[PDB]
């Protein structure tokens, strides 16, 4: 996260760290959506142009974390993966369209003050909240700058951007399964997700019921926090029918 700040304790209890077993390192962010299911970006697991293709046994899920590098004894919980599910129409060839994956845990994780699931949006909450200018919140342990790494989980609040502005900021083809967020050059404020924040959640707090909803997944961006560029996020609601299908069939 660039130009963010340290998270408060328990501020993002759905935040998940995807952790590579060997070498031991941060692979991506992710989010807890139930006691057995974790949501992330497909490119965290599968990206052939960079020779990335992780299997279940390659990774661990670390939940309840605050410190990036510490083993947070008595606080974090570490889970093994039963199965990975990548969207069947994930477009890694072109533009990361449908950049979404689910991971089923081998065993249910116990909820605590530090571990708690985020809601997924319904059609109405999505329609109400996913509007230009409305701010969401992104969290992660990724880079502090485009080109270092944080001691603890970082957080930044960013406004959703009008679709034409998103489109006009890039030569890449944008789809309805993506949205973009961030400040414009003339807005003064800044902030962005970055490398390592991949797969983590873009959340919004509903003013109707005071619950946090995951509207986006950190997907892609041209560099980080560049003037005139924006962060792109997987549109969770647009892909919710797939999420429900996977959970209904394999849950």
């Amino acid at each position: 996260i660039v130009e963010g700040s340290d998270a408060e304790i328990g501020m993002s209890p759905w935040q998940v760290m995807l952790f590579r077993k060997s070498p031991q390192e941060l692979l991506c962010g992710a989010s807890l959506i139930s006691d057995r299911w974790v949501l992330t970006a497909a490119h965290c697991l599968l990206y052939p142009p960079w020779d990335k293709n992780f299997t279940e046994n390659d990774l661990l899920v670390r939940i309840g974390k605050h410190s990036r590098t510490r083993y947070e004894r008595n606080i974090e919980k570490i889970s093994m993966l039963e199965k990975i599910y990548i969207h069947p129409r994930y477009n890694w060839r072109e533009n990361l369209d449908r950049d979404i994956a689910l991971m089923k845990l081998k065993k249910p994780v116990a909820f605590s003050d530090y571990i708690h699931p985020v809601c997924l949006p319904d059609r109405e909450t999505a329609a109400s909240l996913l509007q230009a200018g409305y701010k969401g919140r992104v969290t992660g342990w990724g880079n502090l700058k485009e080109t270092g790494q944080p001691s603890v989980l970082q957080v930044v609040n960013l406004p959703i951007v009008e679709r034409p502005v998103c489109k006009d900021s890039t030569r890449i083809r944008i789809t309805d399964n993506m949205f973009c967020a961030g400040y414009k050059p003339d807005e003064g404020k800044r902030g962005d997700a970055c490398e390592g924040d991949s797969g983590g959640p873009f959340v919004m707090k509903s003013p109707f019921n005071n619950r946090w909803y995951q509207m986006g997944i950190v997907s892609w961006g041209e560099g980080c926090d560049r003037d005139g560029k924006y962060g792109f996020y997987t549109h969770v609601f647009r892909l919710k029918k797939w999420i429900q299908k996977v959970i209904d069939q394999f849950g």
Binding site: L60, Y71, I78, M80
Partner: peptide, 11 residues
């Protein structure tokens, strides 16, 4: 720079 995790999670 990551602290080692209990070996029980690496088996």
């Amino acid at each position: 720079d990551f602290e080692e995790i209990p070996e029980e999670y690496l088996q």
